[model samples]
Target: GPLGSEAHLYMQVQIVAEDQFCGHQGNDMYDEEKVKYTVFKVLKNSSLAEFVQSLSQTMGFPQDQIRLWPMQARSNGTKRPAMLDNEADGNKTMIELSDNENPWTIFLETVDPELAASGATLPKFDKDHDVMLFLKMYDPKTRSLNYCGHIYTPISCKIRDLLPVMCDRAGFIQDTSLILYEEVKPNLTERIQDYDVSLDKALDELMDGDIIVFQKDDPENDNSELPTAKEYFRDLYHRVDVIFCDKTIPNDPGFVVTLSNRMNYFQVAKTVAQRLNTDPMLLQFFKSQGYRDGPGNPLRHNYEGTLRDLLQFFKPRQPKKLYYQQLKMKITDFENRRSFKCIWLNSQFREEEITLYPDKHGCVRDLLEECKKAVELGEKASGKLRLLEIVSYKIIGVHQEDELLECLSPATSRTFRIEEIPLDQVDIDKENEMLVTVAHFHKEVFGTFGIPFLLRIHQGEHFREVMKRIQSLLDIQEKEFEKFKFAIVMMGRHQYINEDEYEVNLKDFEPQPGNMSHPRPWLGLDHFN
Candidate 1:
């Protein structure tokens, strides 16, 4: 609102999204991937180690790998060559966005190139609108690409815009992106000053939807081209958070917390105890309160709650400024226990159950794991296990993606379907499309709002197996499926699954799944109701 005060040499513009099209009925949208005004990665086998050897060490691995490419180049690759010294100044121009430049500003550009082309009325640099930037990633190895995307972060003016060089312009004919990562940032020959000019130019041309090869040569000059930045980033992605919760929970507890095939309720409590002891704050809290059988208030937290619910919520503190610092100081205690059976149904609506301990606060991943163990515990009949698809998945209560257990509403019943993925998996004759499943379940699980397994298929793989297979069936991977494993988290309350999302059940029971597809002659339709 400080339009007048903030701008001395610039015109004022209001930043907003238009809601006129059905204004009263239209919905609004928002996201919070970025918190602070400003915001803000790579490696493989020989890779992870090589990367550690690569950084300035000013920043060690933060435990969790960042999700995007770093701005600075580490090692482009072995065959990589440097960009430019430019040494050319007259041809250079740098454009700066005002204190308010962003994606929304672009939509305000009048959306009319023809008008500007005809010299009728100029299409101004902006007005105000939602500016969403579709960032991208290019893999040189496969000559493939993907949009990395830009999260809306604060824009206090500076943005990279395209400006041309007035030089011979002849050298611009062809462009190549070298993944110039290094075991170290090597500065040989003379030190380059305006080296960033060419660096920016190199990346500037590497815009969205572009494909360029990853340099395969390492500095050693052998064919051992160091992996490209993309490869390193991909490698980092798989290695860093391959486990549950990424760094949200320490991937490991220094204590001897035994991780096994499947942990029971009490075992989980013990394990959490084991894990908490490894951290002073948590250990202090546990010691002060009691993870189980000890003292303290009921420490029951919702499974869907991430690290925040696990840690921050327990704190009885004031302003966050000092709260985190004080958390370890005051020995807060915790205690809670209750046991419930987590059950599920199949296409025929039969049931399968796993007892969840009250204190463990099992996550979707844990629930996912529990389902896997439950199916395999007994005789896993292949015919009973197919790649099941959830038609319209719903979690009755959870409203937002991050609100963990806020949706503790009783679970909703869901219907499961089979691959029906054979191009047109739909029954051409079945008019009631909802009745498309091979079977329906009479039972349910203490899980979020997604339905169950498909007992119809070619390969009768288990839950984990199918999840991995599905990932590759859609794309290439080494540990890529690792990234895809927790991909299910994307289906949290805020982002529910749908037919379009093509959600496959992570775990399954042969005879247990969701509701019936059609009315059974032997039973009333909508029996669950």
Candidate 2:
């Protein structure tokens, strides 16, 4: 459950920026000129055309499906204004074009009013749809640079399916039409266990009246008490069990037998006494000088044999380094082993201690056992302990938000109740609040990872649509429209133009979408409305 959906539609908007021609030379005061000049210069050549063709093919559209249009300004005169003497006058020409306008912007307008009314102007491609806007620039005779035009896609229900793919593609490189919101939990809980002694000792010392308190210290409290000595001892014992059950501690019985066979009475006594945590002075005083070499000193010989046996019993057969390596491998093997049916249940035992119950040990186990029994007559020993350990790790790492999201689909919005805290007025505690704050800030600014939708528009259809729509909307004839279209096609001035010039004028071109505008000298009658 990676927090998104699979269904999506692809969409693309090509852009190109051209400063050498058009009214761009005059619009030195326009801010959009900067964006257009710097960002929209990718539309003149075959790369953009090829990219559009590829996208069309992917979207089940023909090669000629993609189209282009020149951005135009309404004009009464044939020639636009220009400032040829600005450089000689020494008065700064605010309208000089630079390489900044490398990429250009293209617009898309839907001619179907009914579709627009139904919110279908843009298709809602799945998050998996691949969307791209290729920008290619070329001189009349040779290609200059093939640049991809950048656009900020809008987020809406109409294009929800295509959001993820668009995000994956353009979200990283340029802005895409996708908006993402996340509901984060403010509080996180962690469980830590402390044992009193060896597993055997802890079990033996367990009493009905004596309470087994699992203490938790709040990080905010400076005076929190450390765990008691008994708890430390118990934890140590638990570690032993963890090591032994996993076969990390070695067992070599033959070593013990060999040691026993070679030991004398006095040496045997010393060895056994050492294993029992006894003082060496006491054993030395008990053994007679002559008795040190003979079996007649029964106490000494008995202790020696016991010590030897214990050593052999616990001594690992493999080299210590080899054993460690195997342990690491075993850990890796355990981590890599996965089952789809495992479920973790976190239950509070009394008030403080939390224990995890794995479904893999109950219903799932029963089902597995039944299958195994059907195949083989021998009863299989339950690997409950290993399963429990794995389940515990999972339970501890599980986030409630993740679990809740898993139960819900991506189509639904998730709501959370948050205590609103203003950015300037946040309270800080001594705990690791700074770390948490930094992490939250990082996610807020940079965690919008998304996939973009692939938009492929056929050139012939797009061009025809632009021409037809402009004519129908403005009450102009087809032949009259051809002049405007030809101006865009041959002049290559509107390389960064999006959609129909008329439509762009309605949306962005009128006031100039961004900050950079054409200088007054470069402004033409066409730009005068």
Question: Against the true structure, whose lDDT is highest?
Answer: 1
lDDT of each: 0.26, 0.25
Candidate 2 ranges beyond 4 A from true positions: 1-46, 62-529
TM-score quality measure for candidate 1: 0.17
TM-score of each: 0.17, 0.11
List model 1 lDDT by residue over 391-419, tens digit each: 23422111122222222333344232221
Q: What C-alpha lDDT does candidate 1 achieve relative to the native structure?
A: 0.26
Q: Return the lDDT, model 1, position 489.
A: 25
